[PDB]
Design an enzyme around this catalytic site. Structure first.
Site, short mmCIF file in Angstrom:
data_model
loop_
_atom_site.label_atom_id
_atom_site.label_comp_id
_atom_site.label_asym_id
_atom_site.label_seq_id
_atom_site.Cartn_x
_atom_site.Cartn_y
_atom_site.Cartn_z
N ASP A 48 0.82 -1.16 0.02
CA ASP A 48 -0.04 -0.02 -0.05
C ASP A 48 0.72 1.18 0.02
OD1 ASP A 48 -2.09 1.99 1.75
OD2 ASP A 48 -3.07 0.84 0.32
N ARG A 49 0.71 2.08 1.04
CA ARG A 49 1.62 3.47 1.02
C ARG A 49 3.11 3.00 0.96
NH1 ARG A 49 -1.74 6.39 -1.37
NH2 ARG A 49 -0.74 8.27 -0.61
N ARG B 248 4.48 2.53 -2.20
CA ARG B 248 4.58 3.74 -3.20
C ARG B 248 5.83 4.36 -2.68
NH1 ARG B 248 0.33 3.81 -5.73
NH2 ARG B 248 -1.57 2.71 -4.88
N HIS C 299 -6.83 -6.89 -0.66
CA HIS C 299 -6.00 -6.15 -0.39
C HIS C 299 -4.67 -6.32 0.41
CE1 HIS C 299 -3.66 -2.23 -0.96
NE2 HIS C 299 -3.91 -1.76 0.21
N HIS D 82 -11.42 7.52 -1.17
CA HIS D 82 -10.74 7.95 -0.35
C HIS D 82 -9.33 8.66 -0.61
CE1 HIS D 82 -8.93 4.01 -0.97
NE2 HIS D 82 -7.86 4.25 -0.16
N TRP D 83 -8.74 8.28 -2.14
CA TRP D 83 -7.72 9.07 -2.87
C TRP D 83 -8.08 10.65 -3.25
CZ3 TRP D 83 -3.14 7.23 -5.88
CH2 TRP D 83 -2.57 6.05 -5.49
#
Lengths: 296, 298
Positions: free
Chosen positions: B109-110, B113, B279, B154-155
């Site tokens: 997830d984050r 990134r 996810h 939510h983005w």
């Protein structure tokens, strides 16, 4: 709550889907005015007096909004689809003997309005939509920039009770944030403080907030599909219509409004107004003058 | 705070960097492997796959900057400390403090990134890279359509200017963090998570300062992270590090596009496999995720 329509009557119009509350005033050809989110019929309190000089002005709360009854929704958000709202308002106008009338809508009410013109065009003499593009067009232009701007189209469409629970911590904040953020000034100075209290009290009700989310849920699904069928069939609005949008409103951000509405209407006239999203309150004179000239 | 030690035998470290401390659970020996969590989780999301990885590597399970128990650097108008470029630089700093200048990296997830941005900015720091259930941030915003806007709402919601999402999250933070965890699983509920791990995510989410950091993360993801990604696209910059792209069969990455063909446009040496999961791969499918990580990293 203050009476913002002095000299106007108050009618509770029974329909099959529940009562529609409406302020009624003036005389002449019937004119139905429909509000949007997060507002009630009182958003017209600055331009409906001028419209009452020439028209039988019917200032109605949307199904589930303000003081109108709230039909219990379903998995498809049926009663708060614009198609069902239009049928209910047609039924409401029939109770008063209005089977052919002029109609101006703003925000959600405008989406009820153009959906009404597509489904039952024989009910409208003239149509006016304020600071909207069709629901299909908002979704078809939902790129990164637009997704960040009308985030609430995706957020409020989230399955229940996610938006309802988040809105339940501080409803005053969200209703005043939405009112302020969509104006030209970016604050609440354009609105009458008594009108803000009307919107704040309506938004304080958890059932009213669920209705608005159901409205947006229908806007993300059923409303989009009814629109999608009409675009891909090439069904245009034959009713002569006026497309008003704020120079810094929502409709002008995603596209050039008149070119979009020419794809949806065989006879559309468009004009910008120096204002944010709330044309009848941010620019009451210019909006009233535009509606009086069009419908006359 | 009476939480649970989900990493028995793992030491705890507060790694001082220029922008603040990074909390990490450190275990195992061998080559250094950094594990980065995502939203709305903390380092403990690796508690089912970190032990198996610790059989082969010195596993470092770090809270992202501003997440969990790591310090929260003061953000700015550009959300600089929570851009993936700054987070990667801070974690590079953190790894240097342990003597690790060349290490393997797995992010979810984050954290994934942070991971691919790290690989793009400083590829010499990575031996191998693993990203779990993500596509590059640029690809999400590029494929932004009606279906995606409703999917990853939510983005756009968390990227709204403060304090709009902060105030809404404060309306019911316990429901929101649990709703995010449940909605993105295959099961649709919280039955895939260890209850002690959910308590970790809920406590961190109960702190408004932490929630503000998460919004700063998503504001960075909507602006600076997108601009940083866009420049690599337009310059044709590719990730040279051997990388692995795992994604859940019912995850976030499969919605917009097929993840292996997307990541092949971002990396020169990439393999990938779908994992039967939602996810949260390391918790919904710990055996399947750890084996794929173990095989690719060794």
């Amino acid at each position: 709550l203050a009476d913002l329509f002095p000299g106007f009557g108050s009618e509770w119009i029974n329909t099959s889907s529940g009562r529609i509350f409406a302020r009624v005033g003036g005389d002449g050809p019937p004119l139905l005015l429909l509000h949007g989110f997060p507002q009630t019929h009182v958003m017209w309190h600055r331009v409906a007096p001028k419209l009452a000089e020439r028209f039988k002005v019917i200032v109605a709360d949307l199904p589930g909004y303000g003081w109108s009854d709230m039909p219990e929704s379903d998995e498809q958000h049926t009663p708060y689809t614009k198609r069902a709202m239009a049928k209910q308002l047609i039924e409401a106008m029939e109770q008063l003997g209005h089977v052919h009338f002029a109609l101006a809508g703003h925000d959600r009410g405008a989406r009820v309005s153009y959906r009404l013109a597509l489904d039952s065009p024989g009910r409208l003499s003239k149509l006016a939509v304020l600071d909207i593009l069709p629901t299909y067009e908002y979704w078809q232009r939902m790129n990164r920039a637009y997704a960040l701007k009308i985030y609430h189209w995706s957020f409020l469409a989230q399955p229940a009770p996610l938006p309802e629970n988040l809105l339940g911590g501080d409803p005053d904040f969200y209703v005043k944030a939405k009112l302020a953020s969509w104006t030209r000034a970016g604050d609440l100075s354009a609105f009458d403080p008594r009108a803000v209290e009307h919107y704040r009290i309506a938004f304080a009700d958890p059932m009213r907030r669920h209705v608005m989310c159901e409205d947006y849920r229908a806007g993300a699904y059923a409303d989009f599909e009814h629109d999608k069928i009409d675009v891909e069939a090439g069904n245009k609005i034959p009713v002569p219509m006026l497309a008003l949008w704020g120079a810094s409103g929502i409709a002008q951000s995603a596209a050039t409004p008149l070119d979009v509405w020419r794809k949806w209407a065989s006879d559309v006239q468009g004009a910008p107004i120096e204002s944010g999203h709330f044309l009848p309150e941010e620019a009451p004179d210019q909006t009233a003058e535009a509606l009086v000239r069009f419908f006359s």
